[PDB]
Each structure stands twice: as structure tokens, then as C-alpha cells.
Design a protein around this nucleic acid. Structure first.
Ligand SMILES: [Mg+2]
Ligand SMILES: [Mg+2]
Lengths: 217, 114, 162, 131, 138, 111, 45
RNA sequence: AGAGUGUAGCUUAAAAGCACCCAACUUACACUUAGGAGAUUCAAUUGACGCUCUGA
């Protein structure tokens, strides 16, 4: 049979911010830090807070707090640089800085002649080159960005089919180191979608089961 | 009657008339009383769906109910021969304390000659 | 004694060239002792500055209302790690089974792709990644609103160029 | 008859075990001795991830052979911005690995990736080091 | 773990030579499921981190359910069946509560394997078994 | 020149003295050995130089039983914990099936 | 899943107190560390 | 649409045994000790839900 030669990749950004900790996890950090305190021993902070105190409490009748609020005032003047780019935008889902706590996938669109296929980015492999660099040639061309971005593996992650002449698709995986996505308001119709956000961005079984190679969390 | 006095190399010694074996497992703890031949004479496991009702508390429970049953079977002398790490296990100390106080003595008096 | 067998093989004969390798090896003793990196020990070991000063903060109590609370949170924790480990363990289970068929397909499809897939790329040797943080940020050590911890460049020196 | 048709009934040494690279051509290179280095500015978080790695490897039956520690860095505030002084230290620890495949390679990195906590760094490599 | 495996091998057939040769419902589980779920709350898990387990109710539960299975063991270990019936087992489903009189009170009971004195067994025992025509035989 | 000197030790005379199926009274030495070749089984003792003797008057048999050592025997509990999980050790043992029943009840009087 | 290694004690016997210090990097990013002398902030040049 | 069927992870287990999870020791692992968690897809061998298949 003639088989329609086609390649792909899948791109993932890591969470740059740790997960917000669950209501059971927040208590455990409170108890474990409590039990850390009572087993503790020979504190340089408290060597000068309890036992320099008893000479300053009896010199008058014959350090600890003046260093406190200075440790609070730079704790106060430093407004913490926000973990918040969610409620401000709410819309620009093609942002490289939308989600902070979860991994993403790059997701594009090609209005085909036959269907009108919303696409998880693909490739075509020539009879000369490998299947591995077939991933590597497409982040340069199809979206016009500068992603110095490590690939992981030569053996692929996903294999789904459609035969009318049969077709094939070979899903890989990769990461980001940093991101220069050139001209993000481009009409190459692309968007940065989480796991929870592609539930209503996929219709088909050629893309419905590509969740079988994401880290689920 | 003879105890099998040999087996000085292997563990446990098979010199007894009646032994106490316990089977610590997942979800259960068993306690068997055997003869030399391997014929179990009384048992009390938490599979029994009678002590399934009402863990260390599961272990010391069987020391109550099986020491109840050896007196009801005429078995008065025992031997308990554990590995040295379950001899210092907090379950078996409560088992033996419900067994030696429950009536039986785990010491096997000597095979008299002469 | 392969450290000193270069030495007396150069000490016995004594041309000029033999005095260079013997001299350099005394440096290269201490180069190898700084190339191999037994001189350091761990700080797992306890300083006994912590020995006698244990008796500064010894006071604890325990209460039944604390203890019953300290019971169930650990059981819920033993519950919480149990299912999420399974979610993680079925994740690696599902992502190998989506590898295993995905290799058997092209290997039973194309023999060129058969050999090409089972090797990898040697960019797994220089891989290094830094952790998720609490703040990413959009910048930084503060751009000059009034705060900063970046080293600011007027009469420019962090380095000799700027 | 000394030997018997029951000869060799107790042989306790071929069953038991007694007493670089991973070559493996074509499938190729089945990653051998790799030192994954767990580094943190903390102490407890670094240890708790080596905790997580070692239990992960034995769960996946891929062989580990060391868990030792690189000793501790001795740096102050680096006096590059009244000149500041406070000693912040770094705790590095080695986790080794011996058995890996090509086909588990990129995957087993992901479980290390996705579970990696706040402010710690990994660095895979080959072996030429000592304490 | 090895001692568990190795004591499995000493019950196998073993073609060579062995010391053993010369010297040898549906509503029931449904009610039990809610039983443990109910019984997991009144222990407040506060009786775990020291419960008593009253035996006498347990014994009445044992004698009804797993009494006869257990009771057949002692009747074989004591070798009744090879003396009574030349083999030919049976599992006694009727719980026979026989006891003798120590004067007025109390009762010295006989269980399956007990020891009662012939001073106690001068007079015929007081019998009940809570079942419905029988011949009792000593 | 013959630098080698000393190997003039005589033979130990160590082996099975009572082979399989023999009648053995209580106390006879079944075997003498060094470096365990036969372990004690039912009613067989061990002396200081590892000999095997009979503890009851009976008939000596040889079997192949399963070897589980003592948990204080530290030189051979590590022998276990490097075995794979299908493994059992199977040393060989010497038993004595006792012939005489250890006594009978006899009339002594009529009182 | 950055929480799997998150919560732990000090697994040593004799040890000083460790306080919840927020050190912060050249790249702007801050981290919850544990340190003595409870400066709630540290800033690295 | 056709099909194989079906006990929690597994099981020529029938509510079991292993695995598994958190602590306490261990650099850690392992061991051990204290704990923790669970299943017969549902209705009368049938009928009907869950998956994995063969479809378009
Ligand atoms: Mg000689
Ligand atoms: Mg001679």
C-alpha cells in the first residue's frame, strides 16, 4: 500500500512556578516545621535572644528586637514580584507567560482542503533525512520563532492513523530553555494550551488520545 | 514421649511436643498450634469471621482467644521460637503476655528418663 | 608505586629533559590531587559545638487533643500519597504502552525506521535543568522603580569592560 | 554409588552471585554509569529528592549503585554589592545509576523533571570524579 | 521471605527422598461489608493507638460458624476417628454442651479435649445441645 | 634442594561409619567430618569436631531436606539474602528412625 | 507535580533551627530556603 | 455496527496471598518495627454496564 509520509513533534514548557499546595499539603508543612522547632538545638538567633536578655534584664536592676524589624522592613518594601498573569489577561491563550504551575503544549491550525484540521504541529519526512530531524526542521520554518529548545528522544511518543491511501503521524517530545517567539500576534493560528484547555480544542480521535504522552499532574 | 532432639544446624529446633507459630501477613495475623508431625490442633486467625468483628490490637486479641482454646483442648505447655527481631516486636510481647497470663506456659517441661 | 616510578626513572639517568618531567610531576602530584578531587570530608558529620549546648531549648508537652489530631493527619497523608503515587505510576505505565506500540508499528512498517529509532541523540549527556521557583518573574531583581538587587551600571564596573 | 541421580541437589554458588560504557550496538547506548547530581541551597529539600529518585529507580528496577554526597560549598555574600556579608551555603549530593535503556531514557527523565522541587538543579553526566 | 518459601517446599511431592516419607453467601458478605464499616467508627481509631475483645460473645459466634470445622481437627489429632470409626470422618454440626456437677455449683464443663477428674465424673453429666430425636453415647 | 617440607600428615579416617539402612544403638557415631557434609536430622547430635552421633536406638536414613539456617548465624543469613526468589538451598541430613517404643505399661501388682 | 519532594523534616539529630528564608536569584526568581539568623530576605549579588 | 470478555497491581487465590503507601531507624537503599489503603460492572447460568478489539 502507498503510505502518506508525515512527521510531527510535541513541545512542552515546564512549570516555572511550583504548584499551589493543597489544603492537606499546607497543614503538613505547618506540623513538620513545628516539630522541626522543638527538636532544634543551639540556635544562633536564640543564643542572642534568650541569654543576652537575662543580662539585659538584670543590668538595670543590678540585639534581639532591634534586628527584627529591619528584617521586616526589607521584607515589607520588597513587593513580591507576582505569580499572577492569569486574571489580568484571561484571553491571550497564545501567551508564553500564561500558566505558571503546569506544563503546556504548542497548538496550531491549518485549514486543509479536505477537512479543516485543527492541528498539533506536524512535519513531512523526505526519503533522505531521518525521522528525528524531521521534528527539528519545523520550529524554524512553520512558525518563524527562535526557540533554542532541546529535543529528548529519537523513538517517538505517539502513533495514530487515518486511511481513506493511508496516512501516518509520529509524535515526538521536546522542551524549552528560553523563548524568543517572534511577533506573537501572528496569524499563523497558534496557541499555548494546557491539558485542561484542549478538552474543547480537540474534536478528533487523531488528536483525542495524545494525552497518553503528557505528564498528567 | 520423644522430642526430636536433633537438627542443631537448622532453624527452628524441632524438639517440642507442641509449638506456637504465628503468621504475620497483610490484612491478617494467624496463630497456629502444631504437633511434631505438622498436624495443627487449634487455630485462631482474623479470617475467621468471628474475630473479624471487634495491628497489635489484633495480635493481642488472638492471645486472648487462642489461650482460651488450648485450655479447651487440653494443651497446657507450648514453645514459642521466634526470630530475634520479632521477639523484640511490640506485637508478640502482647501476644505472649496474653498467652502466659491466659493460662499456658510456653516452656515445655523435660522429657524425663530413669 | 606508579607515582614515583616516573621519578627515579628520570633521577637515575639525568639528561636535561628528565629533570622537567620530574619537576612537573611534583606539581602534577598536587594537580592530580586537585583533578581527582580524600582531602574533603562531609558536613553530614556533627560539629560538637552542638554537643553541650543541647540543653538550651528542651521543653515539650503533649496533649490528647493534639495527639488525636496528629494521628489522623498522618493517616490522611498516608492516604494522600497513596493515590497520587498510583496516578504517577499509571502515568509512566500509560506512557510506555504508548511507546511500546508506537515502536512496534514503525518497526513492522519500515526497516530503515527500525534501526533509526532505537538509537538516540547524545544531547542527553549535557543536560542540566533548574527548578520551578516561587516567582518567575516579569522582571526581576527589581528594574529601577525604586528597588534593585541587580548590580547597576553607572560608572560601569561589575567587569572591566562595562 | 556416591554421586547419584540426585547429584548437585545443593549448589549454592551458581545461584548466588560471586566475588566504563554500555556498548550494546545498534539499539545503541543503554546509558551506563551516569551521575545525577542533586544540588540545592537548602539541605532538607536536596535530601528529600535523592529520597525520591532512589525509590523511583528500585520501583522501575533500573540499577542504582551509589548515593553519596559531594561536600559543601563555602561562600558568603559574594561581596559584589557598606559591603554585605552573610554565609549562604550549597548542598550537593550524588545519585548514581547503572542500568538505563534508550527507550526508558527520555521517559525516566520526565518523572525526574515533573517531580523536581523548588530551587534544586540536576546535572546528568559520565564518570570522572572522586570526593 | 525465604523461610516462607522454604516451608512451602517441605510440603511438595519431592521424587528424591524426604524426612516426610519415613516419619509422616451473597447476603453474608454484604452484611459483613457494612459490619466493618460500622465497626471502624465506634473505635473512636482511638482504641488503636488498646481494645478488649469480649471472648464470650466471640465463642458463641465461633461455636455456630467455625466450631465444627475446628472441632474435627482435635477429633483427628486425638485419634478418635482411627479408633472410633476406622477412619470415616464426620463434622459435628450439633454443638454438644456437656458438663458435670461440682456439687451444687459451679459446673465443670467438658470441651473437646479437656481434662476432668473421675471424682467429678461420679454422677452422670448435665447435658444440653439446643437442637431438635437423638441418642447420646459414651 | 626440595624447599617443600611438612606434608607428612596421615589420613584422618573421616567418613560415614554407619551407612544407610544400618541399625544404630543410641550413642554410636554415624559419621565424622570436617567442613559439613551431612547435617544432623531427627535424633542425631553434633559434637565439638562436627561428628554426628545417634541420639536414639534406631535405623539410620539419609534424606535431602531444605536448609534454613539460624537467624543468628551471621555467616549464612547473608547467604540467603543474595539468592533470587525461586531459590532454596537443599543440604543433606542424617536421620535415625527409632525402632524401639520407649516403654510399655506392665502389671506390677493386684491391689 | 513539583510537590512530591516538597515536604520534609530535618532528618538529623542535633541541629540548629532553620527559618523560612526567601532567597532570590540574579534571574529575579525567589526560592523558599531554610537558613539560620531569620533574615526573611537574602539577596545574592 | 462485529467481537473477546470482566476478582484492587497480579494471580490453573477462593473475599486469600503477595505487591504497593506513610512513618521510626539508615548518607540513603535494604532489612525490621509500628501503621495505612483497597476489589468480584450490575439484575434473574442467563440477561444487561466497563474496557480492549474488528468497522465506517
Ligand atoms: Mg597430605
Ligand atoms: Mg603417610
Amino acid at each position: 500500500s502507498p503510505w502518506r509520509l508525515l512527521g510531527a513533534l510535541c513541545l512542552q514548557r515546564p512549570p516555572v512556578v511550583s504548584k499551589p499546595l493543597t489544603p492537606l499539603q499546607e497543614e503538613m508543612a505547618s506540623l513538620l516545621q513545628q516539630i522541626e522547632i522543638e527538636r532544634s538545638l543551639y540556635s544562633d538567633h536564640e543564643l542572642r535572644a534568650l541569654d543576652e536578655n537575662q543580662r539585659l534584664a538584670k543590668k538595670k536592676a543590678d540585639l534581639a528586637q532591634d534586628l527584627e524589624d529591619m528584617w521586616e522592613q526589607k521584607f515589607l518594601q520588597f513587593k513580591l514580584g507576582a505569580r499572577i498573569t492569569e486574571a489580568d489577561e484571561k484571553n491571550d491563550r497564545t501567551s508564553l507567560n500564561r500558566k505558571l504551575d503546569r506544563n503546556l503544549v504548542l497548538l496550531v491550525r491549518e485549514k486543509f482542503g479536505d477537512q479543516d484540521v485543527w492541528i498539533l504541529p506536524q512535519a513531512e519526512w523526505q526519503p533522505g533525512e531521518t525521522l528525528r530531524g524531521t521534528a527539528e526542521r519545523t520550529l524554524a520554518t512553520l512558525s518563524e520563532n527562535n526557540m533554542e529548545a532541546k529535543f529528548l528522544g529519537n523513538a517517538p511518543c505517539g502513533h495514530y492513523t487515518f486511511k481513506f491511501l493511508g496516512a501516518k503521524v509520529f509524535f515526538f517530545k521536546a522542551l524549552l530553555l528560553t523563548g524568543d517567539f517572534s511577533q506573537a500576534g501572528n496569524k499563523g493560528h497558534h496557541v499555548w494550551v494546557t491539558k485542561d484547555e484542549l478538552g474543547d480544542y480537540l474534536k478528533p480521535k487523531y488528536l483525542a488520545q495524545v494525552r497518553r504522552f503528557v505528564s498528567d499532574l | 514421649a520423644r522430642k526430636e532432639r536433633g537438627w542443631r544446624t537448622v532453624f527452628p529446633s524441632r524438639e517440642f511436643w507442641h509449638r506456637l507459630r504465628v503468621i504475620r501477613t497483610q490484612h491478617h495475623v494467624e496463630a497456629l498450634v502444631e504437633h511434631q508431625n505438622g498436624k495443627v490442633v487449634v487455630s485462631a486467625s482474623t479470617r475467621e469471621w468471628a474475630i473479624k468483628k471487634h495491628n497489635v490490637v489484633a495480635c493481642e486479641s488472638i492471645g486472648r482467644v487462642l489461650a482460651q482454646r488450648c485450655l479447651e483442648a487440653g494443651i497446657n505447655f507450648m514453645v514459642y521460637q521466634p526470630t530475634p527481631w520479632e521477639a523484640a516486636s511490640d506485637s508478640m510481647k502482647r501476644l505472649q503476655s496474653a498467652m502466659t497470663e491466659g493460662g499456658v506456659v510456653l516452656r515445655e517441661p523435660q522429657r524425663i528418663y530413669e | 608505586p606508579m607515582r614515583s616510578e616516573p621519578l627515579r626513572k628520570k633521577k637515575k639517568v639525568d639528561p636535561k629533559k628528565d629533570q622537567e618531567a620530574k619537576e612537573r610531576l611534583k606539581r602534577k602530584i598536587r594537580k592530580l590531587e586537585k583533578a581527582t578531587q580524600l582531602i574533603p570530608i562531609e558536613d553530614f558529620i556533627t560539629p560538637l559545638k552542638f554537643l553541650d549546648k543541647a540543653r538550651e531549648r528542651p521543653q515539650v508537652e503533649l496533649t490528647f487533643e493534639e495527639t488525636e489530631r496528629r494521628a489522623l493527619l498522618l493517616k490522611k497523608w498516608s492516604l494522600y500519597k497513596q493515590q497520587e503515587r498510583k496516578m504517577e505510576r499509571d502515568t509512566i505505565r500509560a506512557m510506555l504502552e504508548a511507546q511500546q506500540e508506537a515502536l512496534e508499528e514503525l518497526q513492522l512498517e519500515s526497516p530503515k525506521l527500525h534501526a533509526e529509532a532505537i538509537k538516540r541523540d547524545p544531547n542527553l549527556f549535557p543536560f542540566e535543568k533548574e527548578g520551578p521557583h516561587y516567582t518567575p518573574p516579569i522582571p526581576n531583581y527589581q528594574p529601577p522603580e525604586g528597588r534593585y538587587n541587580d548590580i547597576t551600571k553607572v560608572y560601569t564596573q561589575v567587569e572591566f569592560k562595562r | 554409588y556416591k554421586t547419584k541421580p540426585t547429584h548437585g541437589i545443593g549448589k549454592y554458588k551458581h545461584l548466588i552471585k560471586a566475588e566504563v560504557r554500555a556498548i550494546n550496538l545498534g539499539t545503541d547506548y543503554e546509558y551506563g554509569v551516569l551521575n545525577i547530581h542533586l544540588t540545592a541551597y537548602d539541605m532538607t529539600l536536596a535530601e528529600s529528592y535523592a529520597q525520591y529518585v532512589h525509590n523511583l529507580c528500585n520501583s522501575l528496577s533500573i540499577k542504582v549503585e551509589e548515593s553519596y554526597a559531594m561536600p559543601t560549598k563555602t561562600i558568603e555574600v559574594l561581596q559584589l554589592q557598606m559591603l554585605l556579608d552573610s554565609v549562604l551555603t550549597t548542598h550537593e549530593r550524588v545519585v548514581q545509576i547503572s542500568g538505563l535503556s534508550a527507550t526508558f531514557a527520555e521517559i525516566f527523565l520526565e518523572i525526574i523533571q515533573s517531580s523536581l522541587p523548588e530551587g534544586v538543579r540536576l546535572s546528568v553526566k559520565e564518570h570522572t570524579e572522586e570526593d | 521471605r525465604y523461610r516462607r518459601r522454604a516451608e512451602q517446599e517441605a510440603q511438595a511431592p519431592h521424587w528424591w527422598r524426604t524426612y516426610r516419607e519415613y516419619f509422616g453467601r451473597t447476603q453474608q458478605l454484604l452484611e459483613r461489608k457494612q459490619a466493618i464499616q460500622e465497626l471502624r467508627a465506634n473505635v473512636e481509631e482511638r482504641a488503636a493507638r488498646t481494645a478488649s475483645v469480649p471472648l464470650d460473645a466471640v465463642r458463641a459466634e465461633w461455636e455456630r460458624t467455625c466450631g465444627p470445622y475446628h472441632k474435627q481437627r482435635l477429633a483427628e489429632y486425638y485419634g478418635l476417628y482411627r479408633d472410633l470409626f476406622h477412619g470415616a470422618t464426620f463434622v459435628p454440626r450439633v454443638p454438644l454442651h456437656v458438663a458435670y456437677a461440682v456439687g451444687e455449683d459451679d459446673l465443670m464443663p467438658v470441651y473437646c479435649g479437656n481434662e476432668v477428674t473421675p471424682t467429678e465424673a461420679a454422677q452422670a453429666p448435665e447435658v444440653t445441645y439446643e437442637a431438635e430425636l437423638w441418642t447420646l453415647l459414651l | 634442594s626440595s624447599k617443600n617440607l611438612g606434608g607428612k600428615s596421615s589420613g584422618r579416617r573421616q567418613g560415614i561409619k554407619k551407612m544407610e539402612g544400618h541399625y544404630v544403638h543410641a550413642g554410636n557415631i554415624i559419621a565424622t567430618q570436617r567442613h559439613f557434609r551431612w547435617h544432623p536430622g531427627a535424633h542425631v547430635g553434633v559434637g565439638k569436631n562436627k561428628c554426628l552421633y545417634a541420639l536414639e536406638e534406631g535405623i539410620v536414613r539419609y534424606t535431602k531436606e531444605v536448609y534454613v539456617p539460624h537467624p543468628r548465624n551471621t555467616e549464612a543469613v547473608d547467604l540467603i539474602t543474595r539468592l533470587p526468589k525461586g531459590a532454596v538451598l537443599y543440604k543433606t541430613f542424617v536421620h535415625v528412625v527409632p525402632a524401639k517404643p520407649e516403654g510399655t505399661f506392665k502389671l506390677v501388682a493386684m491391689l | 507535580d513539583s510537590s512530591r519532594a516538597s515536604l520534609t523534616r530535618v532528618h538529623r539529630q542535633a541541629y540548629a533551627r532553620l527559618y523560612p528564608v526567601l532567597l532570590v536569584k540574579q534571574d529575579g526568581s525567589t526560592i523558599h530556603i531554610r537558613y539560620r539568623e531569620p533574615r526573611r530576605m537574602l539577596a545574592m549579588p
